[PDB]
């Protein structure tokens, strides 16, 4: 996260880090005690991933962590890495053993199909991750969160030559400065309502990090809510 503030311990209990070939390479969010959501481009064919929940500082041990392993990688059927690396960027991670919820680990709420689009239309959204703080620079050690406003679709298509599909939205500021970066991809984009938080996006990609004209593009979870509830049911 570029231009983000430090997250207090417990402020984002749904946050989840992903470890594999490189430690802390992507983020994730807790659906329930057994399932994690992340970007499909973070986990490809034959990937050795472990999921750590309840994390604040990566290198420090705060005894609030819950380390688990993935045993079933569920990518969306419409995802094709050979066509587009971010078309239908969503994935499901089934853990080996069901977690136990507390104060530092908590699933994120997911509404139905219609409302998930309503919560997104509010405008304000929060993103968090352990990715790069600067463009091609150092990676964050503590959880960094950032509030980003929803930019209209008409402005987003005219800002980049790459195509923006229907199941993707854009968010960010005009003068750059505050934007997600590499490493944050896979984590949560959430909007709050009267205290309760509801998942509405996943960090997908963007042109560099924090630049005028460019915006962070996210995945529209509203188009996959019915697919998330049916696959993560108990």
């Amino acid at each position, epitope marked *: 996260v570029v231009g983000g503030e430090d997250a207090k311990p417990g402020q984002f209990p749904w946050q989840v880090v992903l470890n594999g070939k490189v430690d802390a390479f992507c983020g994730g969010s807790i659906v329930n005690e057994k399932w994690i959501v992340t970007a499909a481009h973070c986990v490809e064919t034959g990937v050795k991933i472990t999921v750590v929940a309840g994390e604040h500082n990566i290198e420090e041990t705060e005894h609030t962590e819950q380390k688990r392993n993935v045993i079933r990688i569920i990518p969306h059927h419409n995802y094709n890495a050979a066509i587009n690396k971010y078309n239908h960027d969503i994935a499901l991670l089934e853990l080996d053993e069901p977690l136990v919820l507390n104060s530092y680990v908590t699933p994120i709420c997911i509404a139905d199909k219609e409302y998930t689009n309503i919560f997104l239309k509010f405008g304000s959204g929060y993103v968090s991750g352990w990715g790069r703080v600067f463009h091609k620079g150092r990676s964050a050690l503590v959880l960094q969160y950032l509030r980003v406003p929803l930019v209209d679709r008409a402005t987003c298509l005219r800002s980049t*030559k790459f195509t923006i599909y229907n199941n993707m939205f854009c968010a960010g500021f005009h003068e750059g400065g505050r934007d997600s970066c590499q490493g944050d991809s896979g984590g949560p984009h959430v909007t709050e309502v009267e205290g309760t938080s509801f998942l509405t996006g996943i960090i997908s990609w963007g042109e560099e990090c924090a630049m005028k*004209g460019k915006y962070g593009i996210y995945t529209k979870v509203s188009r996959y809510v019915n697919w998330i509830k049916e696959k993560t049911k108990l």
Partner: T-cell receptor
Amino acid sequence: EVQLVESGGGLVQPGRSLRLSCAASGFIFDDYAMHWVRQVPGKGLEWVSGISWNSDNIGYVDSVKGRFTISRDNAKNSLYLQMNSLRIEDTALYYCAKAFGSGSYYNGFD
Amino acid sequence: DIQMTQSPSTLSASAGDRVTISCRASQSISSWLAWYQQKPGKAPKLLIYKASSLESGVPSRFSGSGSGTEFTLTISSLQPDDFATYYCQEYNSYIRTFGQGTKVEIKR
């Protein structure tokens, strides 16, 4: 400077086919979308078809939808247009246009 | 889809005058409008984009204004070289409808 050279125009019977070539030069051909725009002497300027930077997004005007085909060769820096089942109403001057700024598919031409 | 209407169809003015060309849209294209100038026998060249932005290299005597459904183009201090047909174009939709164009004649 930026230069776009058309070719392949001429006279053809109704129902036949040609193939226009637009050779680009003086800019990064890979970072800009390209379009075909015709000037009909009775109508005026009219956008005919457009292609994205990597042949991903393709759009046609309703009059040529199903008869015209647009393609590009980023290695050769060339844009092509394949006209099929040509009608007398297709007579016009066919310009080659490149999007400005960010090279977006929904951008105007410079 | 979106009907672009230019006004006037043609006009004549002397050198050093101030010209105003209007361009009205049937809907609301926000600020997605471009102005082109085509001299006889020449290809159209981009002048003003995004309603009010000026393309690099274009003289400062050209100015663009307007937002929403009404747009105007202004040529301060008319020059004989500015004889051409000026077109307005919206790029809000994928059709990119052009205007009917306005021919600018010179009075001498």
